[PDB]
């Protein structure tokens, strides 16, 4: 970046010169160039200034063709400023200007960018358009096919990325395939490919492999000197450490990402989400301290039951131990420490079975089944979930059956049974409505609408939202 000092002076020189000679086309070409340097420096408002004046020179004196790249860059900067409506305006004008000329390549670019803006809106109808434009972009990169290599690999990248936000396996396939294409022929595409690969891996719970991939995304961003890049690589390495109970490393990676974000003038929102993450981990640390204090309390109650066995203080200390275990599963489930959750759930089931309680035993069955699903141990999860369902049947519990059915459907979905998943959601709604419990109906409706929204059924989903 030792060359970005004079490389601006020469471009500002050429802009003032095309202004002094009335070379309108080169006024606008150099306005674009300088706006692009400003964009690559994180100066998005100041990029918008001489992207607006490039747009204006093109509209005033230049043919319509000039409007086509300028609308892209303009629509890009609005995206990085979190101005989505504003982006979409020029993004769509870009698509129009590319269709009326039918050059296909620019039509690919406009579709990739449309899919980007919609994907980014949805995390904050949107998923439908996102999938539509990402798929169209992939098809327009296949049609374009050492010619459109970048666009092809990038379209693979974006389509794989769209998959996981719950099709982890096809995302795995697409991203690994794109990386294979890269090796078949230190690139900025490998950055995002490694990035989303580590993200899907850490969703599949394989930490070390996700660690490796996130780690090289960081390294490659350090080499390219892509500051925002390694800010996102550090924020995801911090996510890795946070999900695996390593909080001090998490705050280290989050502070590093903060320093990267705060060195750019117009990356304010990323720095605010980094601050938000840092305080979330700070709060989880207190939650963990509560965990460990109640664990010590549990050790004391265990020594009290060992001494008061058969005394009828055995049952009292047993229910005290059940209460401690319930507090413990609650704290263990706020933070995402699902292994401790499984521990506490299992020990709750052992002391419910000893206490000859059907209700507590059904609850411990539900919590052990949730603990097993959140590990992505789906078969063991459905076995414990049906255990809890059939135990809730034997007693006068309709809530429990509804809960067990809904969560069982969640497991079914995440295993690839979209059909049985929604069927279980709807059965859960059946029991839910049949027992006049409002919140379980709400949750069942929420996953029903989810199942339908991910299946592109607008009418049904919009009806459930009501």
């Amino acid at each position: 970046m030792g060359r970005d000092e004079m490389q601006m002076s020469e471009a500002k020189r050429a802009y003032r010169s095309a202004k002094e000679e009335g070379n309108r086309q080169e006024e606008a070409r150099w306005a674009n160039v300088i706006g692009d340097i400003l964009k690559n420096r994180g100066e998005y408002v100041e990029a918008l200034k001489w992207f607006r004046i490039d747009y204006d020179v093109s509209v005033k004196y230049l043919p319509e063709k000039h409007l086509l790249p300028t609308c892209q860059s303009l629509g890009e900067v609005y995206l990085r400023l979190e101005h989505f409506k504003d982006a979409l305006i020029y993004q769509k004008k870009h698509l129009e200007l590319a269709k009326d000329a039918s050059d296909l390549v620019e039509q690919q670019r406009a579709c990739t960018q449309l899919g980007r803006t919609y994907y980014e809106m949805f995390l904050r109808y949107s998923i439908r358009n996102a999938k539509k434009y990402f798929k169209s972009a992939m098809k327009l990169a296949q049609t374009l096919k050492s010619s459109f290599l970048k666009e092809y690999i990038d379209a693979h990248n974006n389509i794989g990325m769209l998959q996981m936000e719950d099709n982890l396996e096809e995302a795995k396939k697409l991203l690994i395939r794109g990386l294979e294409i890269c090796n078949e022929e230190d690139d900025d595409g490998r950055s995002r490919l490694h990035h989303n690969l580590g993200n899907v891996y850490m969703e599949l719970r394989m930490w070390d492999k996700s660690r490796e991939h996130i780690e090289q995304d960081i390294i490659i961003c350090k080499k390219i000197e892509h500051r925002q890049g390694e800010a996102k690589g550090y924020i995801n390495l911090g996510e890795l450490h946070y999900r695996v109970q390593k909080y001090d490393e998490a705050i280290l990676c989050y502070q590093k990402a903060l320093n990267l974000a705060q060195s750019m003038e117009d990356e304010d929102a990323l720095a605010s989400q980094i601050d938000q993450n840092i305080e979330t981990v700070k709060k989880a640390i207190e939650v963990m301290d509560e965990l460990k204090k109640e664990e010590q309390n549990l050790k004391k109650l265990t020594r009290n039951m060992i001494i008061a066995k058969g005394t009828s203080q055995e049952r009292k200390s047993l229910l005290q131990q059940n209460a401690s275990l319930d507090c413990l599963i609650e704290k263990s489930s706020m933070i995402f420490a699902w292994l401790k959750h499984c521990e506490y759930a299992k020990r709750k089931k052992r002391i419910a079975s000893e206490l000859c309680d059907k209700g507590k035993l059904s609850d411990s069955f539900l919590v052990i089944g949730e603990s097993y699903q959140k590990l992505r141990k789906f078969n063991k999860a459905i076995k414990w979930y049906t255990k809890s369902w059939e135990m809730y049947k034997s007693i006068g519990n309709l809530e429990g059956q509804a809960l067990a059915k809904v969560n069982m459907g969640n497991v079914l979905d995440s295993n690839g049974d979209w059909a049985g998943a929604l069927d279980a959601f709807q059965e859960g709604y059946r029991i839910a409505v049949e027992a006049n419990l409002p919140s379980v109906q709400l949750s069942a409706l929420e996953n029903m609408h989810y199942s339908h929204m991910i299946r592109f059924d607008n009418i049904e989903e919009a009806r459930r939202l009501q």
Binding site: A14, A18, E26, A28, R29, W30, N32, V33, D36, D54, H66, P69, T70, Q72, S73, E76, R109, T112, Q113, R116, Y119, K150, E151, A155, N157, M161, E165, S191, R192, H195, N196, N199, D217, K232, N236, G238, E239, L270, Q273, Q276, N277, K283, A284, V287, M334, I335, F336, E370, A402, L403, V406, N407, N410, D413, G428, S439, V440, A444, E446, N447
Partner: peptide
Amino acid sequence: KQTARKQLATKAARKSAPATGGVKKPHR
């Protein structure tokens, strides 16, 4: 999705791919 019955969840980050060209190339 939704688990039926205050969790502490951090925000992750994703990386989309830009379009490959919005820049203009002047003459000199």
